[PDB]
Write a protein that binds this ligand. Structure first.
Ligand SMILES: [Mg+2]
Ligand SMILES: [Zn+2]
Ligand SMILES: [Zn+2]
Ligand SMILES: [Zn+2]
Lengths: 133, 183, 160, 264, 773, 65, 86, 196, 114, 43
RNA sequence: AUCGAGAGG
């Protein structure tokens, strides 16, 4: 019931792809050699600017039918501007001493690789991706 | 039409001429001194050719091919190979005349593929229409007549000779091309 | 013909090979010629293959030809159907046609043969021949109106 | 003025009214256009019995035209649907009966107009069944034209009806609907060879709304409450009455659902 | 020939057909008058007496009704006129000829009748209007399109007859075709285009449309899916609602082109538990072909779930497309001016090359080509020049065509359109061919009376530079008319010839059925095949699979499949097996592994012998990959844990499974040998798919998971065995017949003529040839 | 046969226009579309019903019976 | 042919019921049920004879023996209960 | 059917409020599928819709004569001067929702012809009907209330399916079922049988 | 011939209930209401107003076939809240908004002079 | 009516196929379909 | 009945 991982990620390049609404993002962990990520996001909901540093966070929680926020008393889980929900398509190891996690969020896909995370990360269908400006 | 040598001594040209068309148009308007197609044949401006005679002749589709051709072109216009022929014995009166009555009905069949044209000819024979004005007096075994026959919006020139505009067999329906409800 | 063959490593590698194409077929003399592989040579016509090499080789070539026409379509028919047709022509020693000359002329059954073609001729020759129809045939049963020995009709159900 | 929807009419006319609908959900406006097209009651001829027909036009043809002919329906709410009424065939309050006879006395073809049709049934002091003529001459809509030696002689029974039942009862011909003219909502994606702005003309309804600025990001939350609509009347019912009857008819449908629940 | 083989039949109806999205695939929309006229005799039963009395009271005029009542004496009681029509009270043993009611079995038939798929049982739903209503997906096996198409409906009159129709002839059962090993029915036309457009990651569905689509799926979980995007706004990807439509517990993976896990192209699909991870839905995924979602659903659960899936996908996709819309248009055919200039330049360069080749022919400075006349070589070169010109023009058009182009959208969906259609519409329709030749000079040395004599230029010979949009010239139009005329004549001739051919095949093969000994035999008992299809297995449920042992480097095959317990490197890493540290040494286990490796090597040599091409994929009974995927998702193994499974038990269990599969039951040494021959390739596949090293490397299979896989493989193979009694020959003849109708037209007899020579076994051959090697 | 009462697509009355329309195009030598604009029918669904229709009834009238 | 009895132990016909065998068994049981036959299985909300036949097949209550036949003519008789339905 | 070879049945009839509507409110009398056209490859139908729209707005009849060169771009230019889109795609709104359609839909005037064939004449249904005496089989045709004929191909299809009893019922009970008396000694219908 | 009469679309026949309420299965507070002889026109507005209410979790319109004018609406509401009450409140809100619009439009027309 | 009045019938090398000599005399596209296609032509 | 013609898929 706590966040699996948090980082500051600086993106060098965003590729629009064939789609206009959805662009892919190629970022790396800032000051860390170990973590690099490529993630599909929608620019209309939140516009990724080139050379932005954006806070990335993955959280397990915070079946059940989705409920619209019943009132303002129900507190938003995140200050973060962007949140997605999705399921990992694969947990792999890039090379020995290098793990990679491939999470799919609504068909949008993100891959991020780094050793320390695999002890945090679990084969959980639940994941919340939290992007802060 | 017949192409012979040096009309006005200038250049191999069509035997017909604009004043002849003007007199024929005057006769059509008066409907004076008659100017008839049979009269054109007696003038020798036009000749009747059999296929065996056709092998020996050289024909130009367009009367504009014969006049001397000493640049920018709209892309939509279909590419025309230069005729590149010195002598034409005759010129076809209009290309559309090779087509049949049902093909004369078909709109833009040059832009269309031919098998669809054949299917539409058969369907047009099958399509309902007011065959004659005297149908009400007539007692036919099976008669189908449209309530409000509508003349076609896009008509061939040949149609004015076909009398299809005068006695139409279809309705100009507002058509939308869409995927709606899956029917 | 860009044939593919095992490499020394064991991976399949494609080596180009020279092949000759002949407008005519004289199989017996052609195969007994130097400079060719006797095993690899193939004929467009299956009947010459069957006479030169045996019935089974002819059956193989027959299935190959039917495969060629289905591939010219691009359609795929499962191996068993074409195979069954080729076997029906092949089980009889002579290579048997699908036309009346052949399968209808074959002795098995009497009313299936007349249902295909030459109905009255088969019936007349049968009366002169006094052949007894088993009535096992599906077409014969359809004529009889009795339920045919189809899969559903084949087994007999009785009380315990 | 009133909380809820607010309407500012752009243009007024007997034939048409152009208005601006504000603070409205789209579903309600669509439902209102549909109730206006279909549900509003009108009087049109439902039965035709002809004694003599010398016309070249067939009797069924003329009857269909007569059903298509406009008849006044301002007092149609005072008139009752025949199926709601206890008469065996028709009573004077539920049906309006028109008689029409037209002979070709003139050698020239004699036209037959809606003004020639006359009413035998009692008016009962209500504006019902009057033939509608917007023609400047006052000549009615022409059913047939009869050559000399031709007489036509018929009776017509006009009952209350709705356009869902048959298109002839429709009070309005075309309803013009516009929303998101600037495409800020981006409900539609423009098909363009080179440029969408060059390929699609700006609607007249774009200029009323303030033009979108390319600087601001698109808002996902935004929903359009402003619509530009136009109602055109045949004349059997006046435009203001047509749209008011659409509103009222939808209200009666909703109330019928509510009272059905109360009965449950 | 006519009356006995084919009778005019009572209780037969015929109507024009129209397509209804909402009606279920198995159902048929039967007009109310048709159901009222058609009567099913139903013996009065204690359960049905009340219903039947109500039907009789309702009468022939109104359905549910009954036209006739049959007494115990059998005297007819006519409902339309009877003095006791209201008097009657039902008595046991009586028969009521009920009006045809909803959810009753009938037979729906198309007149070409090339296939068993053209005649299938259907559930009845009585429709108000007049035209037969059917699902779109059932059009393809019926080969019908809603242009006045007319189809026949036949009603069973007996309960045994009804049970035959429902148990064997039902639409969901015949979804999978025995021939071609693919399902017959797939999502067609707007549903395919719409599913593609919905699956795009750009496409996102708002909560209102999401709720309405959730409701639109007839069986809904009741749980609103968690939004793909939450915090900005609760956006939902169309893939998520589509996944809610996908049945849970089914996993599909397809790798095409660059199917990276990141998949920037979005090509291919990954579905786990009926939930799509990545992809854009394409035709093959939802298509009739094997490896499609239809085949997987039909195999895993059954046919009924598959038909329901057809329905649900149709409803959701049609609603979404209804909101989005689609329109072909003039402008989707139009092309950019720059690309059009490149098009005309390409055509001009082709013409210049043709004229230079013609000049070289005139100079006689043209190389002699062996085996062909020099004129023949000239004709072939010019024809190829024009063909390449048209194809390159079409390529320029397609690159010019935007992603928004609706013909491109249909082609990407695969629903409709072809590259050639675009090329003819925008650049060039091509060079017309008559009798396999360029247009001939009917007049001496002139193809047309306008053309000068002795002209061999493509315009004289009939090459149409212009597109369909720009319009054909009169000469081009006449030549195109010649081509179309040949096409129509050939079409009619092909239909006639293929009808005769199909009848001959059917009559030749009809009597042969699989007898109870599994020997394919005719009625007389002459054995056509000792084992049917040489494997003794039903043609359905067989899908192509790749055999990993064939092909590849010998060293790589050794690395993947060989484990030696003695060498430190060869022995499995201890993370893979808990026994692994104990496994080091363990010479008695190493000898068993060496034995299995020797078996694998012999199998590899055998498979290399069978196919010189060594093509990986061949039709096989049981899809191992899907079973392995189902095991991995069912037991959710993290694959960190060492396998519970002994290194001995994998080999012994695989051997036990080989002993378990018997095509033929009898304990005859000849029958045993024939069984081993039948399952030789299947055993090779099973050993290649699950090697001890492979079982521990590709996944960390728990011993229970390996046992489950073994049981499932055995069960599936037993499902795949051919049912005895099946009439194999008629199915074979129809299998040839329908594609033979479909075929339409280096110089060899091909298609229908070649087939006719093959079938006639004629001595003469139009194109004999010897392939000298 | 005769002038339609209303355009099929939307339903605006076109029976009133026909006589006036012919009179306008004869009186001013007007373009047909300009006469349609004077008729007040601005939608092509209304325009087609007037322009495409031909009075077969006049020829039927010419018959004596 | 005549006394072509096959030992019940020495039977090589497939243990699984052929789909034709199931179809004809279900049809015959439903046909008899429609003609007021006794029903040996307790029924819940079923009136259709074919549903009762399918339930009986799942119960294996039907006392019918399918006689498997061979091209030679030797008959192998299998009870419905003996045959696996799957 | 259309003037360009496209033929089809009426799938359904829709009320005007249900059908999609443009901002002008014009509802198409006819709705067709985009998918039929690419395989049929009939550009001329689309060109006819464009030209007829131009003609309806202009009031001047359009020429669709063969071998006469008219630019689609020029016709689109005239449509542009009218203000309608050059391609002729029109922004539409879904009838049920009132929502704007995501894709603009081609809206044109198209000449369409009513084919002779009509469903209600075509429909025939016979459960029991008159029979020709010699055949003892159903008569032929709707006019005779005559049954459809199962084909030999249909019988073969049923053999492929495997339902012997269904084919027996269609083959005998549905048509020319007959009971005969025959003798055991000679396999001929020599026996004459009196049942009373 | 076989085609149904037009009249059947707007009048209920054979005592058909205008609304039939049946509790939804597998959803705790949901209920399916079959509106009979009713069209899309009413249903879209009813669903939209149900979506506006905070307590309603689910509302949607479905018609099983275009031939028959039956409209099916399933309602899921917050616990302690009647779905029927939600539907009635949404309907009453619809009526109040339509009345207010009618009054405003009438005032504007009285201002209009044509 | 007009098309029936202008009818050609060829009773029965390659008669069905459209010929170059047909140009200017016979309609390229008017012919029966399926059976007897091109044997009958329209002038 | 038959023959013929035509048309539809
Ligand atoms: Mg068809
Ligand atoms: Zn009354
Ligand atoms: Zn209009
Ligand atoms: Zn005897």
């Amino acid at each position: 019931s706590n966040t699996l991982f948090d980082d500051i990620f600086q993106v060098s390049e965003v590729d629009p792809g064939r789609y206009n609404k959805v662009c892919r993002i190629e970022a790396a962990s800032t000051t860390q050699d170990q973590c690099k990520l490529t993630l599909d996001i929608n620019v209309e909901l939140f516009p990724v600017a080139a050379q932005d540093s954006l806070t990335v966070t993955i959280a397990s929680s915070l079946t059940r039918s989705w409920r619209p926020p019943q009132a303002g008393d129900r507190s938003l889980a995140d200050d973060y501007d962007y949140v997605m929900y999705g399921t990992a398509y694969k947990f792999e190891e890039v090379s020995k001493d290098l793990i990679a996690v491939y999470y799919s969020f609504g068909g949008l896909l993100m891959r991020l690789e780094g050793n320390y995370r695999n002890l945090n990360n679990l084969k959980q269908e639940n994941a919340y991706l939290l992007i802060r400006r | 039409f017949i192409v012979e040598d040096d009309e006005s001594l200038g250049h191999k040209e069509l035997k017909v001429r604009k004043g002849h068309i003007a007199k024929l148009m005057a006769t059509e308007y008066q409907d004076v001194e008659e100017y008839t197609w049979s009269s054109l044949l007696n003038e020798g401006l036009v000749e009747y050719i059999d296929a065996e005679e056709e092998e020996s002749i050289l024909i130009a589709m367009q009367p504009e091919d014969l006049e001397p051709a000493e640049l920018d072109v709209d892309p939509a216009k279909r590419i025309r190979v230069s005729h590149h022929a010195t002598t034409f014995t005759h010129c076809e009166i209009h290309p559309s005349m090779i087509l049949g009555v049902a093909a004369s009905i078909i709109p833009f069949p040059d832009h269309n593929q031919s098998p669809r044209n054949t299917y539409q000819s058969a369907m047009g024979k099958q399509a309902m229409g007011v065959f004659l004005t005297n149908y009400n007096v007539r007692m036919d075994t099976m008669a189908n007549i449209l309530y409000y026959p509508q003349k076609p919006l896009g008509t061939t020139r040949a149609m004015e000779y076909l009398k299809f505009r005068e006695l139409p067999a279809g309705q100009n329906a507002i058509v939308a091309i869409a995927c709606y409800s899956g029917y | 013909y860009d044939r593919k063959v095992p490499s020394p490593t064991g991976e399949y590698v494609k080596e180009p090979e020279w092949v000759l194409e002949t407008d005519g077929v004289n199989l017996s003399e052609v195969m007994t010629v130097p400079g060719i592989d006797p095993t690899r040579i193939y004929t467009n016509s299956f009947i010459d293959i069957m006479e030169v090499l045996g019935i089974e080789a002819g059956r193989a070539a027959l299935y190959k030809e039917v495969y060629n026409v289905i591939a010219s379509d691009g359609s795929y028919v499962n191996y068993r159907h074409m195979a069954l047709l080729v076997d029906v022509m092949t089980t009889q020693g002579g290579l048997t046609s699908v036309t009346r000359h052949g399968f209808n002329r074959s002795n098995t059954g009497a009313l299936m043969r007349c249902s295909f073609e030459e109905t009255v001729e088969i019936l007349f020759e049968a009366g002169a021949s006094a052949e007894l129809d088993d009535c096992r045939g599906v077409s014969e049963n359809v004529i009889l109106g009795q339920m045919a020995p189809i899969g559903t009709g084949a087994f007999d159900v009785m009380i315990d | 003025s009133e909380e809820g929807p607010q309407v500012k009419i752009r243009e007024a006319s007997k034939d048409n009214v152009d208005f601006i609908l504000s603070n409205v959900d789209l579903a309600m406006a669509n439902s209102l256009r549909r109730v206006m097209i279909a549900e509003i009651p009108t009087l049109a001829i439902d039965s035709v019995e002809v004694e003599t027909n010398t016309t070249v036009l067939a009797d069924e043809f003329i009857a269909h035209r007569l059903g298509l002919i406009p008849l006044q329906s301002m007092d149609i709410e005072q008139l009752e649907y025949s199926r709601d009424c206890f008469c065996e065939d028709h009573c004077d309050k539920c049906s309006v009966v028109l008689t029409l006879q037209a002979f070709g006395e003139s050698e020239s073809t004699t036209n037959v107009y809606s003004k020639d049709l006359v009413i035998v049934s009692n008016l009962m002091g209500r504006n019902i069944g009057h033939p509608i003529i917007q023609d400047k001459e006052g000549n009615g809509v022409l059913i047939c034209k009869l050559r000399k030696g031709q007489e036509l002689k018929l009776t017509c029974v006009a009952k209350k009806g709705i356009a869902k039942e048959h298109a002839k009862w429709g009070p309005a011909a075309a309803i013009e609907f516009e929303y998101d003219p600037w495409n800020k909502l981006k409900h539609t994606d423009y098909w363009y060879e080179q440029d969408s702005a060059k390929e699609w003309p700006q609607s007249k309804n774009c200029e009323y709304e303030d033009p979108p600025n390319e600087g601001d990001p698109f808002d996902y939350k935004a929903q359009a409450d402003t619509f530009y609509m136009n109602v055109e009347s045949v004349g059997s019912i006046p435009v203001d009455q047509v749209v008011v009857r659409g509103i009222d008819t939808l209200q009666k449908k909703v109330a019928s659902i509510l009272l059905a629940l109360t009965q449950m | 020939r006519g009356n006995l083989m084919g009778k005019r039949v009572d209780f037969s109806a015929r109507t024009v057909i129209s397509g209804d999205p909402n009606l279920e695939l198995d159902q048929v929309g039967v007009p109310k008058s048709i159901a009222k006229t058609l009567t099913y005799p139903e013996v009065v039963t204690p359960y049905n007496i009340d219903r039947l009395t109500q039907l009789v009271r309702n009468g022939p005029n109104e359905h549910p009704g009954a036209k006739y009542v049959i007494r115990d004496s059998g005297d007819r009681i006519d409902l339309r006129y009877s003095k006791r029509a209201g008097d009657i009270q039902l008595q046991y043993g009586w028969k009521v000829e009920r009006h045809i009611m909803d959810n009753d079995p009938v037979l729906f038939n198309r007149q070409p009748s090339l296939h068993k798929m053209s005649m299938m049982a259907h559930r009845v739903k009585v429709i108000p209007y007049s035209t037969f209503r059917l699902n779109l997906s059932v059009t393809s096996p019926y080969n019908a399109d809603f242009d006045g198409d007319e189809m026949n409906l036949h009603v069973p009159q007996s309960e045994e007859t009804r049970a035959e129709l429902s148990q064997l002839c039902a639409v969901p059962l015949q979804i999978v075709s025995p021939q071609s090993n693919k399902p017959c029915m797939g999502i067609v036309q707007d549903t395919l285009c719409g599913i593609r457009k919905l699956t795009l990651r750009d496409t996102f569905i708002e909560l209102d449309q999401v709720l309405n689509m959730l409701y639109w799926v007839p069986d809904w979980d009741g749980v609103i899916p968690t939004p793909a995007i939450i915090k900005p706004k609760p956006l939902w990807s169309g893939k998520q609602i589509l996944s809610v439509a996908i049945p849970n517990g089914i996993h599909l993976q397809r790798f095409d082109e660059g199917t990276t896990l990141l998949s920037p192209k979005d090509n291919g699909m990954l579905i786990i538990d009926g939930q799509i991870i990545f992809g854009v839905v394409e035709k093959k995924t939802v298509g009739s072909s094997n490896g499609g979602l239809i085949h997987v659903v039909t195999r895993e659960k059954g046919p009924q779930v598959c038909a329901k899936l057809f329905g649900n996908i149709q409803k959701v996709v049609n609603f979404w497309l209804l909101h989005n819309g689609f329109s072909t248009g003039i402008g989707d055919t139009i092309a950019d001016g720059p690309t059009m200039r490149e098009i005309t330049e390409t055509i001009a360069e082709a013409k210049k090359k043709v004229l230079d080749v013609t000049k070289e022919a005139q100079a006689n400075l043209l190389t002699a080509k062996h085996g062909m006349t020099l004129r023949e070589s000239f004709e072939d070169n010019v024809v190829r020049f024009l063909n390449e010109a048209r194809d390159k023009a079409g390529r320029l058009a397609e690159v010019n065509l935007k992603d928004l182009n609706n013909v491109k959208q249909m082609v990407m969906a695969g629903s409709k359109g072809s590259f050639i259609n675009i090329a003819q519409m925008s650049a060039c329709v091509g060079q017309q061919s008559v009798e396999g030749k360029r247009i001939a000079f009917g007049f001496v040395d002139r193809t047309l009376p306008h053309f000068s004599k002795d002209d061999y230029s493509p315009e004289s010979k009939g090459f149409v530079e212009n597109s369909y949009l720009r319009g054909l010239t009169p000469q081009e139009f006449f030549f195109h008319a010649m081509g179309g005329r040949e096409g129509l004549i050939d079409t009619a001739v092909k239909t006639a010839e293929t009808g005769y051919i199909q009848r001959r095949l059917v009559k030749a093969l009809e009597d042969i059925m699989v007898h109870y000994d599994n020997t394919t035999r005719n009625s007389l008992g002459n054995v056509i095949q000792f084992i049917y299809g040489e494997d003794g297995m039903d043609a359905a449920h067989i899908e192509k699979q790749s055999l990993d042992t064939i092909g590849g480097s010998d060293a790589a095959f050794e690395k993947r499949y060989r484990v030696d317990l003695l060498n430190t490197d060869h022995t499995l890493d201890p993370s893979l097996l808990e026994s692994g540290s104990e496994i080091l040494g363990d010479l008695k286990l190493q000898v068993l592994l060496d034995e299995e490796y020797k078996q694998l090597v012999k199998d590899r040599k055998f498979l290399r012998e069978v196919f010189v091409d060594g093509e990986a994929n061949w039709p096989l009974p049981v899809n191992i990959r899907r079973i392995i995927q189902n095991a991995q998702q069912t037991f959710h193994i993290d694959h960190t844990k060492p396998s519970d499974l002994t290194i001995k038990d994998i080999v012994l269990g695989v051997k036990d499974l080989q002993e378990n599969l018997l095509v033929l039951r009898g304990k005859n040494e000849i029958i045993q040998n024939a069984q081993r021959d039948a399952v030789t390739l299947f055993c090779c596949l099973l050993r290649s798919r699950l090697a001890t090293r492979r079982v521990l490397q590709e996944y960390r299979l728990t011993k229970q998971a390996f046992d489950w896989v073994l049981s499932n493989i055995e069960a599936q193979f037993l499902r795949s065995v051919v049912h005895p009694g099946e009439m194999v020959g008629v199915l074979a003849a129809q299998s040839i017949g329908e594609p033979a109708t479909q075929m339409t037209l280096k110089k060899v007899t091909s298609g229908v003529p070649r087939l006719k020579e093959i079938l006639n076994v004629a001595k003469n051959m139009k194109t004999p040839s010897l392939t000298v090697y | 046969m005769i002038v339609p009462v209303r355009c099929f697509s939307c339903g605006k009355v076109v029976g009133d226009k026909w006589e006036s329309y012919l009179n306008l195009l004869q009186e001013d030598e007007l373009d047909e579309g300009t006469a349609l604009s004077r008729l007040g029918l601005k939608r092509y669904c209304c325009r087609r019903m007037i322009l495409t229709h031909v009075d077969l009834i006049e020829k039927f009238l010419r018959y004596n019976p | 042919l005549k006394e072509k009895a096959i030992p019940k132990d020495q039977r090589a016909t497939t243990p699984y019921m052929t789909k034709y065998e199931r179809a004809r068994i279900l049809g015959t049981r439903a046909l008899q049920i429609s003609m007021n036959a006794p029903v040996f299985v307790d029924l819940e909300g079923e009136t259709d004879p074919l549903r009762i036949a399918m339930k009986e097949l799942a119960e294996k209550k039907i006392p019918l023996v399918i006689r498997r036949y061979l091209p030679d003519g030797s008959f192998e008789d299998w009870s419905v209960e003996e045959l696996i339905v799957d | 059917a259309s003037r360009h070879g496209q033929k089809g049945t009426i799938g359904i009839t829709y009320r005007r409020e249900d059908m999609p509507f443009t901002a002008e409110g014009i509802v198409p009398d006819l709705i067709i599928n985009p998918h039929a056209i690419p395989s049929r490859m009939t550009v001329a139908h689309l060109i006819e819709c464009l030209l007829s729209k131009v003609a309806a707005l202009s009031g001047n009849e359009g020429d669709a004569s063969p071998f006469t060169d008219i630019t689609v771009e020029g016709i689109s230019k005239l449509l542009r001067e009218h203000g309608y889109q050059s391609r002729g795609f029109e922004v539409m709104y879904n009838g049920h929702t009132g929502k704007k359609l995501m894709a603009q839909i081609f809206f044109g005037p198209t000449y369409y012809q009513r084919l002779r064939h009509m469903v209600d004449d075509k429909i025939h249904a016979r459960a029991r009907g008159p029979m020709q005496v010699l055949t003892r089989q159903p008569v032929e045709g709707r006019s005779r209330d005559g049954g459809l004929r199962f084909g030999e191909m249909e019988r073969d299809c049923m053999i492929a399916h495997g339902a012997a009893s269904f084919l027996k019922e269609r083959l005998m009970e549905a048509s020319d079922a007959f009971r005969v008396h025959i003798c055991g000694i000679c396999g001929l219908m020599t026996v004459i049988a009196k049942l009373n | 011939m076989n085609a149904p009469d037009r009249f059947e679309l707007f009048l209920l026949g054979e005592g058909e209930s205008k609304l039939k309420i049946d509790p939804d299965t597998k959803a705790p507070n949901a209920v399916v209401i079959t509106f009979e002889k009713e069209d899309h026109t009413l249903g879209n507005l009813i669903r939209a107003e149900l979506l506006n209410d905070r307590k309603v979790l689910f509302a949607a319109y479905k018609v099983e076939h275009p031939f028959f004018a039956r409209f099916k609406l399933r309602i899921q509401t917050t616990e302690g809240y009647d779905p029927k009450d939600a539907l009635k409140n949404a309907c009453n809100s619809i009526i109040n908004k339509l009345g207010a619009l009618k009054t405003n439009f009438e005032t504007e027309w009285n201002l209009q002079t044509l | 009516t007009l098309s029936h009045l202008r009818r050609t019938n060829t009773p029965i090398a390659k008669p069905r196929q459209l010929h170059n000599t047909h140009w200017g005399l016979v309609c390229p596209a008017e012919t029966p379909e399926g059976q007897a296609c091109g044997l009958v032509k329209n002038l």
